[PDB]
Write a protein that binds this ligand. Structure first.
Ligand SMILES: N[C@@H](CCC(=O)N[C@@H](CSSC[C@H](NC(=O)CC[C@H](N)C(=O)O)C(=O)NCC(=O)O)C(=O)NCC(=O)O)C(=O)O
Ligand SMILES: [Cl-]
Ligand SMILES: [Cl-]
Ligand SMILES: [Cl-]
Ligand SMILES: [Cl-]
Ligand SMILES: [Cl-]
Length: 239
């Protein structure tokens, strides 16, 4: 029978990866489904799992693909293969409207929630090394992004840093009308990607060939508009 490929996701990051009526959908998922439509070789299983388990399962080859609004880092690239980028998604600071927090450095001394292993953690840890007398209070949580965004709306925490597309989507869909988003600097292009277990070179090649085809023929843009709510593709030369 066809080779079973398991794609691992968290499924709590609307609109990249989430459930509708119990079924997994969102840009990462629907892109993967479109990629794999044109294969006789691979049958994909889409599996919801814990964030940390995506990575440990890729390490053990329990899983072959990871997808959940995943950024490039050198630490991850040391262990996993990356696809070509699938979207560009810059960071924002989510704060109550009219907060004192107006620019990145204003977070100094304020409290936020973070989830271990996400890229904002080392970002904020670096910030604290630079502002050691007025550090951000980091509260590690196991709760999901919408939960954390609502906690800022309710005043339990002062701000949340996350990608714009999910921040905006959640604030709109959950009617959190007392929040706003502030654009933050990007150190590098803020791309997101599929990742793969390190031994899955042929799979990576297949996915990349498909992404180039889908980019060129307009399908990827169609999916970005449909699931992300706008045209957020990476730059052509980066494909
Ligand atoms: C674990 N927490 C999560 C999701 S965070 S893990 C899923 C996801 N990550 C991302 O979207 C990746 C963020 C960045 N681009 C990167 O690459 O690190 C996200 O929603 N990150 C939010 C954040 O960083 O605060 C959850 O589902 N809790 C409910 C439960 O397990 O019981
Ligand atoms: Cl669920
Ligand atoms: Cl088939
Ligand atoms: Cl099939
Ligand atoms: Cl919740
Ligand atoms: Cl405040």
């Amino acid at each position: 029978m066809d080779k079973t490929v398991t794609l691992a996701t968290v499924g709590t990051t609307n609109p990249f990866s989430y459930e509708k009526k119990g079924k997994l959908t969102g840009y990462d998922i629907e892109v993967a489904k479109e990629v794999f439509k044109a294969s006789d070789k691979y049958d994909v299983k889409y599996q919801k799992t814990e964030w940390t388990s995506i990575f440990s399962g890729l390490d053990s080859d329990k899983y072959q693909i990871g997808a959940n609004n995943i950024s490039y880092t050198k630490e991850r690239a040391n262990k996993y293969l990356y696809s070509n980028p699938t979207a560009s998604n810059p960071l924002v600071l989510v704060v109550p409207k009219d907060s004192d927090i107006k620019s990145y450095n204003d977070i100094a001394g304020h409290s936020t929630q973070v989830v271990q292993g996400n890229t904002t953690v080392p970002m904020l840890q670096k910030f604290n090394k630079n502002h050691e007398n007025n550090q951000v209070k980091l509260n590690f949580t196991s709760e999901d992004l919408a939960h954390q965004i609502r906690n800022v709306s309710d005043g339990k925490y002062d701000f949340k840093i996350f990608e714009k597309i999910s921040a905006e989507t959640i604030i709109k869909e959950q009617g959190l009308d007392n929040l706003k988003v502030i654009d933050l600097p990007s150190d590098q292009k803020p791309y997101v990607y599929f990742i793969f277990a390190q031994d899955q070179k042929d799979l990576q090649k297949f996915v990349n060939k498909r992404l180039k085809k889908l980019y060129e023929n307009g399908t990827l843009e169609k999916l970005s508009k449909k699931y992300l709510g706008g045209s957020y593709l990476p730059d052509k030369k980066d494909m």
